[PDB]
Design a protein around this ligand. Structure first.
Ligand SMILES: NC(=O)C1=CN([C@@H]2O[C@H](COP(=O)(O)OP(=O)(O)OC[C@H]3O[C@@H](n4cnc5c(N)ncnc54)[C@H](O)[C@@H]3O)[C@@H](O)[C@H]2O)C=CC1
Ligand SMILES: NC(=O)C1=CN([C@@H]2O[C@H](COP(=O)(O)OP(=O)(O)OC[C@H]3O[C@@H](n4cnc5c(N)ncnc54)[C@H](O)[C@@H]3O)[C@@H](O)[C@H]2O)C=CC1
Ligand SMILES: NC(=O)C1=CN([C@@H]2O[C@H](COP(=O)(O)OP(=O)(O)OC[C@H]3O[C@@H](n4cnc5c(N)ncnc54)[C@H](O)[C@@H]3O)[C@@H](O)[C@H]2O)C=CC1
Ligand SMILES: NC(=O)C1=CN([C@@H]2O[C@H](COP(=O)(O)OP(=O)(O)OC[C@H]3O[C@@H](n4cnc5c(N)ncnc54)[C@H](O)[C@@H]3O)[C@@H](O)[C@H]2O)C=CC1
Ligand SMILES: CC(C)(C)[C@H](O)C(=O)O
Ligand SMILES: CC(C)(C)[C@H](O)C(=O)O
Ligand SMILES: CC(C)(C)[C@H](O)C(=O)O
Ligand SMILES: CC(C)(C)[C@H](O)C(=O)O
Lengths: 276, 278, 278, 278
């Protein structure tokens, strides 16, 4: 029954729309997405899914019950000025934009109607295979059932939980950027397999299966990742020799550096936006 | 395969992980599984008992019970248990060695002193078979029948990915997907430390980091695109992800994971060469 | 036994540390202990004398006094004193070698040239036996009776942790708990320097750093949880500890301690290889 | 006093650790302790309840129960609970803030708006109070009576080392002994990895590494000698320990621990600067 809109018909709109329709929670034709350029590739893929496309953001707003903001963060103020007069009391406005605060969104929208229902979320591209990692925070006028509705919807495409808004920039550096850390690691592990004599295709398949299985083990275990590691490492054995060379390069410190750098850049960009 | 009895020589981490995976998959009833260990007071033995798996101190009883016999002892114990139960191997047995490094030829040579034509398969797997997401390769031995490889692939596919390989790939597979979960646990612990540094509670940071790794791995498995293209899709221009990828690159992140696979593979080969010297 | 007599061949640091621990524990009166060194002017010799330990320059006299005979000379002197005292070993003697690296085989070979069936135990301990918090492992030799191992474990448990191991673990134990105290002394000196840099008086910084290390070690010994979980409990999100852990990780702190255990273990094995060649 | 009543505002890790230590020491019966948290479903809340500690969601009830009132909430919550309970502080109350970074000045300013002359003590402790081996410092506030400091030192000495300091030392103490246990847990995990690399079972490696750290720390606390002298006594010429110390030095081991104390102390000061601005 629910009509869903995406302002911005790009990578994230495609990923969510694919996940929602694969989950069977939405019919593709009950989704509408808008972008200025109707000839983009993401738009073609959405079109082939059966999603409704239009260049006009107002049509997306008028179609939608739940309205996702899926444009780049510096575009958010422009489209809020554009469609703010079109937001109705029935709308739930879900901002997916990195860094952009609920306060900044409500300030724009409240100049039109007084009580906009805003939810901010951070998700990631694996919603496309229904294994996303999603957090959300509720705005000033978001009703209790608004947050419940959004958790049910986003749980259909992965993990979803409510957070205080002040955690979301850190979540962005961990699970928002996290898939890229994983793709980098998987490319490098495959190079390692190839160096040691494996065909590339097998090395890619085995590395990716190893990462998936290990992540699932941790999610299903009550034990600390160090204990799961201890269970792998036999005394004198192959694994503990390999963990040593990771440690000698400061492997752990690089991943900490990465989360920190993505979080800090997220905060720094929003600081630029608020100054502007 | 209801007519199939499965046994484990060794009742430790891998025997538990496989028995838990097989029974969760429904391909084996736990009472059709027997496992043996000289220490019936181990945490893995207690876990196997509560599953319904039959337990005995005596390896000979495992052999007599089993059709498919998994060798799940440490690699240096393999020649001792081959000498112990070699005279008990029957024509019906398929011997599946899971031991790192240990060659099919060394196993066949030991068993053939007792009865010619032992049916031997060598595999390398990993602990995530316990959640039915293992990564398993196997190589068939000299006297393994064609049906033996198909049978073993059917059984091991129920607990994850499984494919046949030439034996000379297995030591490298060991360094990639055998040791792989440990690389992942290390990475996930570090990613969680990063989440905590930036203000997340530890439990949430662990959950999100693990989910991000799982989802990305599944994306790559289900996509036709290169990991670099999927990575390019994450990084917006000027954005948070590309800033983070730069600091990974500045530390030689990629080279460390190459070093790891290499070090595990080389150690695997080194240990077997020491065993072959003995 | 409260009638048991104990001897040390080599009245140096370890003989002092064990004798101090045994007597502080009350398991031995100092007068049941005899120690021998060629130089009766050593400081360790004077310290033992003040405790009430019997001293002599003659290793034969220590052998005649003793039931349990500790060998506490430097490893390259072990063959020399075995040649000197071998004809004086009796049926009643338990010979306990504390020497790093020196194998039970090499000791039994020297002593068996004089008299068959020497009862030999090899141990590795560490200096904190002086405060009854040592870490000790032992392996029993070919002719040690079952009660010899139990007696030695009872004695050494009075001054710290003590457990039986296979002899092939002892060189690795040497690199971990034998050299271990030196790693801790280095760490405590540096932690104190950090406290001083941030404005603490040296005496307070030393006291707090050592207390923190002691308490943390005791927590781990008394906990069922992984050290990573205990570390996670210390680290509040965004907080001081997680910031400090990051700078440790950026320097490869963990890899340095792995390097250290490895280097001590490898050196221990290399030194014994040189002795065996000679 | 055996009539003294103790309260914890914030029934989390530190409240559990202190309550466990106080009761294990016998200085307080569990029923003289009350702790409050807004979520009565927390694991720390259940652990305290099993010990016999009184629990309530209402911070006012803890204040009414208590003579000595510990503030054991996260630092940014301190101003919130001072506003909540300030009108309930009485002449009899000793308010002991355990919060990292939070100054006596800021606490006395909030409480004095309700009632003049609050008796305030600030402390910094660490988690090993749970095994009665904490490291604790305290500074007395403007209106603390002389016996208030003595009472607090007597109480906190029951669970470890405790001494009075000037308040301007506490942020540095935080970086040394407050974060200290986490440095030790990291070191012990890595030492165990080294033991495992060289062939030790994990459980034995963890046990020996922790015992070595504990014993070394106890040696230093009981010795009059410099940690460098104790280190010198471990290092035999040409031997295993001095080889291992070299590889520590080549990685700048000492500098990493200095970096850590500094980073924790600086972060502690920075967090309080942010609070003071707010
Ligand atoms: N891609 C992901 O997996 C995730 C992205 N996000 C957030 O989602 C938002 C979009 O990310 P992507 O989809 O990656 O960027 P993208 O660049 O692929 O798509 C952006 C879309 O906005 C469209 N657009 C530009 N100007 C517009 C306007 N005036 N009106 C309407 N549409 C307009 C562009 O044509 C394009 O279709 C960003 O704020 C990003 O931070 C958050 C979580 C993960
Ligand atoms: N743990 C893993 O994830 C994987 C392990 N492997 C291989 O599986 C084998 C076992 O690995 P884990 O189970 O991790 O070792 P583990 O040490 O947990 O279990 C070893 C078992 O062998 C038993 N055992 C010792 N001597 C025995 C004897 N004479 N007869 C019967 N049982 C005896 C021990 O009591 C213990 O139950 C090794 O060869 C390892 O390389 C292969 C791939 C993955
Ligand atoms: N110091 C420690 O905490 C530990 C030391 N060990 C082992 O204990 C043995 C000695 O260690 P330290 O006491 O540190 O050495 P140390 O050099 O302090 O004492 C060695 C003693 O042997 C004496 N000695 C030299 N030639 C002798 C002879 N011909 N007959 C009798 N005594 C003779 C020396 O005079 C000196 O008193 C070494 O093999 C060392 O590996 C093992 C574990 C811990
Ligand atoms: N954990 C340790 O070993 C040490 C901690 N500290 C300090 O102790 C304080 C707490 O440390 P942890 O116990 O580790 O924190 P924790 O987070 O484990 O426990 C904090 C407790 O405060 C409770 N809380 C939250 N809002 C509250 C409210 N409005 N009223 C009452 N209780 C409330 C939480 O529910 C939780 O039970 C912090 O200021 C920390 O700096 C100082 C020295 C050592
Ligand atoms: C799975 C593997 C054989 C690599 C194990 O982790 C080991 O190190 O022995
Ligand atoms: C998901 C995320 C917002 C982190 C995106 O990958 C970006 O870098 O802009
Ligand atoms: C004990 C300490 C206050 C340093 C805590 O571990 C933290 O990091 O907040
Ligand atoms: C205890 C030990 C044998 C390791 C001594 O410290 C040495 O280096 O010789």
């Amino acid at each position: 029954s629910m009509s869903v809109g995406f302002i911005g018909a790009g990578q994230l709109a495609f990923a969510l729309a694919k996940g929602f329709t694969a989950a069977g929670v939405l019919a593709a034709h009950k989704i509408m997405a808008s972008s200025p350029d109707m000839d983009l590739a993401t738009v073609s893929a959405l079109r082939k899914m059966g999603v409704k496309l239009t260049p006009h953001n107002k049509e997306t707003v008028q179609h939608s019950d739940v309205l996702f903001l899926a444009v780049k963060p510096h575009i958010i103020p422009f489209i809020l000025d554009e469609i703010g007069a079109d937001i109705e009391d029935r709308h739930i406005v879900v901002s997916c934009a990195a860094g952009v605060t609920i306060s900044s969104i409500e300030k724009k929208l409240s100049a039109f109607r007084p009580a906009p229902r805003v939810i901010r979320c951070m998700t990631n591209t694996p919603v496309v295979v229904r294994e996303g990692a999603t957090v959300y925070a509720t705005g000033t006028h978001a009703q209790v059932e608004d947050g419940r509705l959004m958790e049910q919807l986003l749980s259909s495409v992965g993990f979803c939980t409510e957070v205080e808004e002040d955690l979301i920039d850190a979540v962005t550096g961990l699970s928002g950027s996290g898939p890229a850390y994983a793709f980098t690691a998987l490319d490098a592990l495959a190079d390692g397999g190839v160096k040691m004599g494996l065909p590339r295709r097998l090395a890619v398949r085995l590395g990716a299966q190893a990462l998936l299985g290990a992540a699932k083990m941790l999610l299903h275990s009550e034990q600390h990742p160090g204990q799961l590691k201890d269970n792998v490492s036999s005394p004198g054995g192959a694994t503990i020799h390999a963990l040593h060379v990771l440690e000698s390069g400061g492997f752990r410190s690089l991943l900490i550096n990465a989360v920190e750098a993505s979080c800090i850049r997220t905060r720094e960009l929003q600081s630029m936006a608020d100054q502007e």
